C-alpha cells in the first residue's frame, strides 16, 4: 500500500500528527453538486498528486469523458462541467504515489446497482409529493418514546405476511395487511402495538459480499453491519436496484407514511468501521486517513470487523456529521443510534448531538456505549464508564438486561425472571433508570435519558430462546409468564423502553445466537407464530398502553427519580416499588408495582400511602384489602394505585 509521496504535502506524512491541522476544508460542499447548467466537483485528497472525474454514460459502461481536477483549498480538488450531466454516472480517478485507484465519491447520495459507480441526479425529483410538508408525531422527553427494532427484510419476507412489495421499503408502507386466520400484519400490527419509534437496522449502502443486489431472484439476506456508501440507502430494499432514484423515492415514501401513522424512524448507523479496510473509497482516496492504524502501520480492530475509521481525525469527524445531517435534512430521520458507539470518541458524539439539537431535540441519539480496547485512548471513547461526558445520549443498559433474563454468554445461567438468586439490586438499578440513586443502587448514568432498556434486541438469543436455554424443569406456561414479566419490567423502568420486533409474540430464531447472515427461515419475522400468539400481542399492547398513561413512569430527570421512586419491603425472587406524590404529573397520587417472580401465593404489605386500587395485572389478585394487603399468585407484575 502506497501512502503517498510527502513532497507533495509539504513532507509531512499522512500518520504524523502535524497532518490532520494542514488540510482540514471548512466548507460545505464536498460531493458534486447537480444543476442542468453545471455540476460542480469537489473532492478531499492531499495525497494525490493527480485527480480525475471519470463520466460513464451507463452503470457497467466504458468512460466517455476523463476529465482532470485542479486543485484547490485545504487538500480538495475541484471541477466544474458546463453540461447537463443529468443521467450520467461517475468516479474519482486519483494517483496516489505510484498506486492508482478508481473510486465512488465518498459523498455519493445516489448510486449504481451494488454501489460501484456515483449516479448523478437532480435530487429534488427523488421527493414524494408533499414531502416538504411532512410533520413529525409529537415528542417530549425521550423518555416518552417506545422503540420497536426492526429489519426491513424480516418485517415482510415470511410468505404468509400479505404484504406485495415484500423484503423492500415499500412492503412497510401498506396497509390494511393481513395474515393468517386474518390477523393483521406488518404496518397495521405495528400502529396496533402503540410503540413510538421504529428503529430500522442498516437501510444505508451495505456490500455486495453481503447481498448481491444483482441476485435477488435467490436467496439472500443479511443485517447489513458491512458499510459501503454511508450517504445513500440500501439497493435490495428498493423495487429496482438498477435505478438510482427508486431506492431513495422509496425511502422517502417509507419515512412520509410511518410519520403520517404516527411513528418516528430511527437509523442504525455504523460509523466505527467500514465492509474491507483495503478496498473502500477512503483507503483508495487518501490512504491511511480515514482509518485507525497500529503501532506497525497496519489497522486498529477493536471492532473485530478488519478495521475502526479514525472518528478523532477531524476530516473523518466532519465526514460522519455531515453524513448524520444528511440523513436529517434528506430524509426527515428521527434519531439514530450508533453501532459499537464505544469506538467512537466523546468528542465527536458530543458534537453530533450539538448539531441535531440546534436542528430538533427530539432527535434521538442512543448507541452500544460497550468497554472496549482500541488505539483511541481510554479517557476519550464514548462508553459507559464516560458517560458523565456525555449528556443526552442514551446508552444500552447491560446490566439491566442481564439482571432480568440471566448471563448472555453461559447459556443455561438464570436471571430474575426464572428464579435465579440475588438478582432483585440488579433489577432495581434498571428500576430506577441506571442512575446514582444510592446506595449499591447505581449505574452509569447520570440522568435516565442515558439509559436505554432491554431484554431483547437483533444480537444474542433472543428471549423466549434464553428462557428455554435456562429453564430445563420449566414448562411452556411457565416460560411464557416468565417472558411476559421481562417485558413488564422494561416498560415500566425509568429511562428509555426499547422491544424486538417480534417480542411480543415470543420471537424465536430456533436457538441461533447471532443471526446476521442466517436464511429468512430464522430471521423473518413468522405472522403464524404470530397468530398464534395474540393474547401475548394484547398483553404487550396493554403494558405500552399503561405507560402512556402514566408520567409517573418516565421521569425526565435523576431528581425526581431520586425524590418520588422508592423500594418497598419484598421477599426474595420479587421486586415492589412505589412512584409517589404525582411524580412527573401522573394523574395518580401513587403508583405501586410487583415484579413476581415466584410461582407460588404471596401476601405482601402495601405502604400506607392510602385507598389502592387495581391498574394492572388484576388477574394476578387474590386479594386486595385496605394495615392494607396484596396477595397474589403467579409469575407476572401488578400496578395499583392510590387515586388523586
Ligand atoms: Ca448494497
Ligand atoms: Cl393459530
Given amino acids: 500500500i502506497d501512502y503517498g509521496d510527502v513532497t507533495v504535502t509539504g513532507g509531512i506524512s499522512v500518520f504524523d500528527a502535524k497532518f490532520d491541522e494542514l488540510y482540514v476544508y471548512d466548507g460545505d460542499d464536498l460531493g458534486a453538486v447537480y444543476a442542468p447548467e453545471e455540476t460542480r466537483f469537489r473532492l ?167 447481498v448481491d443486489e444483482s441476485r435477488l431472484d435467490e436467496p439472500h439476506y443479511n443485517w447489513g453491519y458491512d458499510p459501503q456508501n454511508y450517504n445513500v440507502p440500501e439497493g435490495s430494499y428498493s423495487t429496482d436496484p438498477h435505478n438510482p432514484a427508486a431506492r431513495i423515492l422509496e425511502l422517502k415514501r417509507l419515512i412520509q407514511k410511518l410519520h403520517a401513522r404516527g411513528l418516528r424512524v430511527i437509523m442504525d448507523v455504523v460509523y466505527n468501521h467500514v465492509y474491507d479496510g483495503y478496498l473502500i473509497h477512503f483507503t483508495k482516496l487518501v490512504p491511511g486517513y480515514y482509518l485507525r492504524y497500529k503501532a506497525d502501520r497496519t489497522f486498529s480492530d477493536g471492532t473485530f470487523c478488519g478495521n475502526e475509521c479514525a472518528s478523532e481525525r477531524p476530516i473523518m469527524r466532519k465526514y460522519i456529521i455531515e453524513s448524520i445531517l444528511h440523513w436529517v435534512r434528506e430524509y426527515h430521520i428521527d434519531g439514530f443510534r450508533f453501532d459499537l458507539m464505544g469506538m467512537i470518541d466523546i468528542e465527536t458524539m458530543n458534537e453530533i448531538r450539538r448539531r441535531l439539537d440546534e436542528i430538533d431535540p427530539t432527535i434521538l441519539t442512543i448507541g452500544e456505549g460497550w468497554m472496549m480496547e482500541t488505539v483511541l485512548p481510554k479517557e476519550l471513547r464514548a462508553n459507559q464508564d464516560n458517560a458523565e461526558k456525555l449528556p443526552g445520549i442514551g446508552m444500552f443498559n447491560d446490566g439491566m438486561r442481564d439482571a432480568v433474563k440471566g448471563d448472555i454468554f453461559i447459556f443455561d445461567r438464570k436471571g430474575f425472571i426464572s428464579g435465579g438468586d440475588g438478582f432483585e439490586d440488579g433489577v432495581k438499578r434498571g428500576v430506577a433508570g441506571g442512575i446514582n440513586y444510592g446506595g449499591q443502587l447505581r449505574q452509569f448514568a447520570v440522568e435516565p ?28 406456561e411457565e416460560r411464557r409468564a416468565m417472558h411476559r414479566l421481562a417485558s413488564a419490567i422494561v416498560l415500566t423502568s425509568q429511562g428509555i423502553p426499547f422491544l424486538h420486533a417480534g417480542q411480543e409474540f415470543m420471537r424465536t430464531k430456533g436457538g441461533v445466537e447471532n443471526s446476521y447472515k442466517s436464511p429468512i427461515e430464522v430471521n423473518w419475522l413468522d405472522w403464524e407464530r404470530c397468530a398464534a400468539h395474540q393474547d401475548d400481542v394484547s398483553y404487550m399492547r396493554s403494558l405500552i398502553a399503561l405507560r402512556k398513561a402514566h408520567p409517573a413512569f418516565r421521569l425526565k430527570t435523576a431528581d425526581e427519580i431520586r425524590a418520588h421512586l422508592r423500594f418497598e419491603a419484598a421477599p426474595p425472587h420479587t421486586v415492589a416499588f412505589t412512584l409517589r406524590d404525582h411524580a412527573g404529573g401522573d394523574p395518580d397520587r401513587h403508583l405501586y408495582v410487583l415484579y413476581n417472580a415466584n410461582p407460588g401465593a404471596l401476601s405482601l404489605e402495601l405502604p400506607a400511602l392510602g385507598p389502592w ?26 400496578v395499583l394505585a392510590v387515586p388523586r
Avoid at 400479505?162 to 397495521?188: A, C, M, Q, V, Y
Avoid at 434464553?466 to 414448562?475: D, N
Fill in 449 to 476: 435519558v442515558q439509559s436505554v432498556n432491554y431484554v431483547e434486541c437483533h444480537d444474542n438469543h433472543t428471549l423466549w430462546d434464553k428462557i428455554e436455554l435456562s429453564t430445563p424443569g420449566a414448562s411452556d
Fill in 613 to 638: 386500587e387495581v391498574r394492572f395485572g388484576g388477574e394476578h389478585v387474590l386479594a386486595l384489602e385496605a394495615g392494607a394487603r396484596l396477595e397474589v399468585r403467579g409469575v407476572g407484575v401488578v
Fill in 44 to 210: 478531499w485528497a492531499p495525497t494525490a498528486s493527480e485527480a480525475f472525474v471519470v463520466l460513464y454514460e451507463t452503470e457497467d459502461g466504458m468512460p466517455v469523458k476523463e476529465l482532470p481536477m485542479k486543485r484547490d483549498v485545504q487538500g480538495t480538488w475541484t471541477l466544474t462541467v458546463a453540461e447537463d450531466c443529468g443521467g450520467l454516472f461517475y468516479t474519482y480517478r486519483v494517483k496516489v504515489g505510484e498506486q492508482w485507484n478508481e473510486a465512488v465519491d465518498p459523498y455519493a447520495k445516489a448510486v449504481g446497482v451494488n454501489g460501484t459507480k456515483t449516479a448523478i441526479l437532480d435530487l429534488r425529483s427523488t421527493n414524494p409529493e408533499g414531502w416538504e410538508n411532512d410533520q413529525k408525531p409529537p415528542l417530549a422527553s425521550p423518555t416518552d418514546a417506545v422503540i420497536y427494532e426492526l429489519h426491513v427484510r424480516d418485517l415482510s419476507i415470511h410468505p404468509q405476511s400479505g404484504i406485495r412489495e415484500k423484503g423492500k421499503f415499500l412492503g412497510l408502507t401498506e396497509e390494511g395487511t393481513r395474515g393468517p386466520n386474518g390477523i393483521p400484519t406488518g404496518l397495521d400490527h405495528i400502529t396496533g402495538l402503540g410503540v413510538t419509534h421504529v428503529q430500522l437496522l442498516p437501510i444505508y449502502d451495505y456490500s455486495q459480499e453481503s
